[PDB]
A paper describes a structure:
Bacterial cellulosic polymers constitute a prevalent class of biofilm matrix exopolysaccharides that are synthesized by several types of bacterial cellulose secretion (Bcs) systems, which include conserved cyclic diguanylate (c-di-GMP)-dependent cellulose synthase modules together with diverse accessory subunits. In E. coli, the biogenesis of phosphoethanolamine (pEtN)-modified cellulose relies on the BcsRQABEFG macrocomplex, encompassing inner-membrane and cytosolic subunits, and an outer membrane porin, BcsC. Here we present cryo-EM structures of the E. coli Bcs macrocomplex positioning all seven BcsRQABEFG partners and multiple c-di-GMP-binding sites.
Here we show BcsE and BcsF interact in an asymmetric and heterotetrameric BcsE2F2 complex. In particular, BcsF adopts an X-shaped dimeric conformation within the inner membrane, stabilized by a hydrophobic N-proximal transmembrane interface burying 626 Å2 of surface area with free energy gain of −15.5 kcal/mol. At the C-termini, each BcsF protomer recruits a BcsE partner copy via cytosolic β-sheet complementation interactions with the central 9-stranded β-sheet of the interacting BcsENTD. The BcsF C-terminal tail threads along a shallow hydrophobic patch onto BcsE’s degenerate NTPase* domain and provides an overall charged solvent-exposed surface for the assembly (∼837 Å buried interface with free energy gain of −12.9 kcal/mol). Consistent with the observed complex, BcsF truncations before or after P43 preceding the C-terminal cytosolic tail lead to incomplete Bcs macrocomplex assembly and corroborate the requirement for stable BcsF-BcsENTD interaction for vestibule complex recruitment. The cryo-EM structures presented here are consistent with the previously characterized tripartite architecture of BcsE, comprising a degenerate trio of an NTPase*, REC*, and GGDEF* domains. Nevertheless, rather than engaging in head-to-tail interactions as proposed previously based on indirect BACTH interaction assays, the two BcsENTD modules pack against each other in a head-to-head dimer, stabilized primarily by hydrophobic and π–stacking interactions in the center and by the peripheral BcsF C-terminal tails at the periphery (747 Å buried with free energy gain of −2.7 kcal/mol at the BcsENTD dimer interface). However the REC* domains, which are not in contact in the crystallized states, engage in head-to-head dimerization interactions mediated by a α4–β5–α5 interface, observed as a canonical REC domain dimerization interface in many phosphorylation competent response regulators. An intercalated c-di-GMP dimer is found at each cis-interdomain interface of a closed BcsE21, stabilized by a composite R306ATD-R415TGD I-site tandem contributed by the corresponding REC* and GGDEF* domains, respectively (see below).
Numbering used by the authors:
A (entry chain E): 5 to 213, 222 to 487
B (entry chain U): 5 to 515
C (entry chain S): 4 to 53
D (entry chain F): 7 to 53
Write the structure that this text describes.
Amino acid sequence: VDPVFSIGISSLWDELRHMPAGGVWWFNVDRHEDAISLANQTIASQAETAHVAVISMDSDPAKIFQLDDSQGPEKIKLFSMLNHEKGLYYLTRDLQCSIDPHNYLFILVCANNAWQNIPAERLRSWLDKMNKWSRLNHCSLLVINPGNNNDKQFSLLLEEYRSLFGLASLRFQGDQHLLDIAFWCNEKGVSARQQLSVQQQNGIWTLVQRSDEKRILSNVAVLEGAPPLSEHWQLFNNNEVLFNEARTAQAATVVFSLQQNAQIEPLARSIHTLRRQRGSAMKILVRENTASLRATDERLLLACGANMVIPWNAPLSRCLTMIESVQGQKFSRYVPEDITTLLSMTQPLKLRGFQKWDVFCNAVNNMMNNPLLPAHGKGVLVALRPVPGIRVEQALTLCRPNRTGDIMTIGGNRLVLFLSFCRINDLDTALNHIFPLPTGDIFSNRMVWFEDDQISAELVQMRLLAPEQWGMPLP
Amino acid sequence: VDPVFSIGISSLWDELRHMPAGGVWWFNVDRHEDAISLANQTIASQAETAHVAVISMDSDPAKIFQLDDSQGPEKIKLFSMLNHEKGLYYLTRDLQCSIDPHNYLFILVCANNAWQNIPAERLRSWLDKMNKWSRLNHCSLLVINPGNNNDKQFSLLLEEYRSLFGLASLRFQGDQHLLDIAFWCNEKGVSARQQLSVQQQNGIWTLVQSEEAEIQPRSDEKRILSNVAVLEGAPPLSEHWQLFNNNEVLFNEARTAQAATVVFSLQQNAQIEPLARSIHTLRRQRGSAMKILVRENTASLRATDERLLLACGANMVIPWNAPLSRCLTMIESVQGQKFSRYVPEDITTLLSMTQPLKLRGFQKWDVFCNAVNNMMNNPLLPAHGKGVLVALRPVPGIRVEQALTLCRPNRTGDIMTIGGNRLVLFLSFCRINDLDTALNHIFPLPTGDIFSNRMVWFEDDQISAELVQMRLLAPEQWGMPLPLTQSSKPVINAEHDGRHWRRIPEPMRLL
Amino acid sequence: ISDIIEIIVVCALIFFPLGYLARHSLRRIRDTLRLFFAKPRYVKPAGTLR
Amino acid sequence: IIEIIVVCALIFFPLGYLARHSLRRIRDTLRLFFAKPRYVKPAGTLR
Ligand SMILES: Nc1nc2c(ncn2[C@@H]2O[C@@H]3COP(=O)(O)O[C@H]4[C@@H](O)[C@H](n5cnc6c(=O)[nH]c(N)nc65)O[C@@H]4COP(=O)(O)O[C@H]3[C@H]2O)c(=O)[nH]1
Ligand SMILES: Nc1nc2c(ncn2[C@@H]2O[C@@H]3COP(=O)(O)O[C@H]4[C@@H](O)[C@H](n5cnc6c(=O)[nH]c(N)nc65)O[C@@H]4COP(=O)(O)O[C@H]3[C@H]2O)c(=O)[nH]1
Ligand SMILES: Nc1nc2c(ncn2[C@@H]2O[C@@H]3COP(=O)(O)O[C@H]4[C@@H](O)[C@H](n5cnc6c(=O)[nH]c(N)nc65)O[C@@H]4COP(=O)(O)O[C@H]3[C@H]2O)c(=O)[nH]1
Ligand SMILES: Nc1nc2c(ncn2[C@@H]2O[C@@H]3COP(=O)(O)O[C@H]4[C@@H](O)[C@H](n5cnc6c(=O)[nH]c(N)nc65)O[C@@H]4COP(=O)(O)O[C@H]3[C@H]2O)c(=O)[nH]1
């Protein structure tokens, strides 16, 4: 009786694609443009006779939403709601005023970070009421949400899996998108926790479809003047020949050596190629001999396909035990095909020294909104209050950042610094590197923000500072 | 507050066994005796305080259903109904007549092929009404359906997700039963499309050792459950961090997780074996999606104990040498990884693998050769990492028994013997890279003042060949310890202060 | 004639809320009637098998 | 008199009962007619 609808993903299995006429489905997206594209394709994939409506926060849906000429419904009805939570609260009655909702598909494309301010309890109540209304009217609702940080909200959605008939996510990974289907319920059954890869070609979302295990291939420098432990050890002078011989290997163990910082970039490429051509059976280890690494470079090597990076603090015996640790293990993580999108994450700010208030806030906000950066680990935002007897300009005189991604600003008797990729524990060392005199004889108090939400809130409270309260270095 | 009931299957994951109050679960079973067995085990599997009621047909439930004296609720209330469709319709209000079904568990054990006469639409309406009733009354219903053939009914139930929290089937296949879970939903997520092999051992249903990676929901993939000592007084880095005072509490919290990183802290060697047991339990109960990390804070680990922790199920042991930032990077290095190694059922074997010699000091030639041979014939020890066999030739000034006087092993697995002017010594679980360290610990500090040259064997074939050559030595050339009467005088100017070799200066005349 | 129509209207009026409240509270009426005695038929409690 | 009053009562009782059973229908039709969209305003059927 009640028809089944289809999600806007090409070449998707019937178990994960259909949408019977009763229920609510939720979809998360990383960027607003991707949400709009998915909404347009979902409109385009439907049958000619089906009933479809689109509700968008953005004004003039006639300008941002389109139809397919070849197939799709003859007409779709657009709705616009003001930027108020009361719009979502009244949605059901407001639609009842204008449509009879029997077998009607509602695509709700919210604005960017639209669901960020909705409280947890009211979101739960909204989901429950929408499920009840959908089952009563035999209508289906698809919710498409372009957001940035929804971990708590995603946990809420997972806990409310009874109200939802399906939860999926689309994450941007440079050249391909990752479709994470938490669960999907249809007339063909229930599916649980699939991870799939989807790519956009011409604006269309299409799904992208024992012998030497004990062998150990290692650089000579890994064994600090030590005999080969077993028959299974081959010793190589540099990582180049090691890469060439590992190309042929299948499930062998490869141990690179990091002596110099300049090797990090080519090592990354080597690991990438070795993890692409050769599958998850191979085990890639990077033994760091001299202190020639940052946390960011280690994250890059881990993303490029290294099992783990062994620090230089660990002596040889611990490194050998760690080599024993990775045995029998497969590399389940995803390595993006594009290599430049990984190296671009090494330094995303590219601004040094003093910045005015507005440029500082814009730069830090832009870095915070970057999807291709570690969560809660993008940097540390610090506000320093100078002791009485010295001004913020004098504190700016005694402040010389050394890295590229470190920026400063002065305003409202505060010196506000941002240090990129620095962790909260290693903050005082950084401050000692920056200031000539000890931090403690120059500043009275320290406020620190290092989580994404905290930094965003501090930035939104830092734009409220009216001008003429900002500061510049004295010429 | 509401209870979480459990299905009567042993060794089954919490994902597929918990049944929270407020739902309807459907069970298709092959044989009536199997149905009654499952019903009885499910009755016995509940908490003592749990209120459970059973509904049966065409029999007296007081005679066919049994309660266990060791496990299960103290008392259950039985119900029997005539083999009629009217009973299936009236169930809700008939039960409401007697007891107010708040936080109760109703086991609906039907007659053979009883749901064969119920039409499709009325069955769907019944499922919807039962879902509504269960939600309102905060009670759970477990329908056990004996059926010779319900393929169409199974398909209808497959479409009917919105009225059931779980649909499962149990089919007999000659030697084992296959548990086919179409979908199962509890407080821990949604599982779907799993085929399991179960067997009835001593009348109790159990999972065969095929756990593999079947914990489909990974809702807590970002949660980091760590000991408070792992962060050296640093703030919790993210909201995903939950700190704990000790490993005991952390273990209790982690037994309910799915894919959360669990970071233990090791500070004393006394805490290695129980940590190993806990890790074994966790990896045996919570599958391969979990990330178990052991973080050393002070020097408290050997290579053998690290191997024990790794073989119990831990992904990585972080040395105390690595500072906190490196440790956090190593924590994030293991994200999204599955533990694909094999963890045995018996922890006793793993515990015994940590010390397979248990014999210290001087040995006869026979005892030494046999002990080393038995150590290298144990198929539970790392290859080419069992130990180091070293033969020492003394300097011309000293004999061999005197050199025996000059060696005092400290660890339990270290043995030595004298024969053919050769002091040969086996140090168990010693790598070739750190042989000098061991020799310095068990000899006066400069070893070139007691031995001219040494020969080292650290590979299994090499040590076997050396033992074969040593067994050929004539018994007349074997050595014996010198009696304490003559060994009182130091051979060299050194003395042993319990565990330290101190070198005593002696008078001499310069040239 | 007029008085007849007036009384008819009055009866109509008074009896519309009557059938409105009879349906509105119907579920509660049924619940109470069950509570009092009803007829607990079909499914019959066997006993408390301790 | 009394008889016709009883007849009118009888008429109105199931009449009001059927009117209540269609509460949802009545609300839906009234919402269609009155048409007070407070926050969600249809921008328009697009081709
Ligand atoms: N103690 C300490 N000093 C720090 C740190 N970060 C920056 N510096 C100081 O700042 C100078 C400039 O660093 P940069 O602008 O990032 O420019 C750096 C950077 O681009 C590169 N570099 C050096 N080591 C690494 C490394 O391990 N990783 C990466 N990604 N780049 C590195 O070399 C450039 C020049 O390095 P230097 O000549 O040594 O000079 C460095 C060094 O004196 C730090 O974490 N600790
Ligand atoms: N934003 C920011 N953070 C800073 C700065 N200086 C230090 N940090 C932070 O402090 C951590 C530890 O620095 P370290 O103890 O000097 O220990 C450093 C240092 O010895 C060395 N290193 C890294 N980059 C450079 C470099 O460019 N030059 C030199 N000479 N050493 C470097 O690598 C170690 C590990 O560095 P990381 O893992 O990156 O972790 C660094 C980083 O998070 C700074 O100027 N800006
Ligand atoms: N520097 C150094 N000394 C070594 C080493 N191996 C043994 N010793 C010395 O040998 C003594 C006796 O060790 P044990 O008989 O195995 O008996 C040991 C052992 O059963 C246990 N123990 C201590 N630390 C560890 C450890 O890290 N791992 C394990 N598995 N047991 C330990 O405590 C007992 C007594 O230990 P201690 O009082 O410290 O006394 C130790 C220590 O002084 C080594 O690799 N390095
Ligand atoms: N058979 C034998 N091997 C010996 C002996 N002494 C040293 N070794 C070897 O030398 C390695 C390094 O010992 P370390 O440098 O003193 O460094 C040691 C030491 O600091 C500590 N440790 C281990 N056991 C004990 C112990 O019983 N007591 C104390 N105090 N420390 C210990 O743990 C570190 C790592 O030990 P391992 O991983 O086992 O690795 C040990 C072990 O393979 C010995 O008397 N007998």
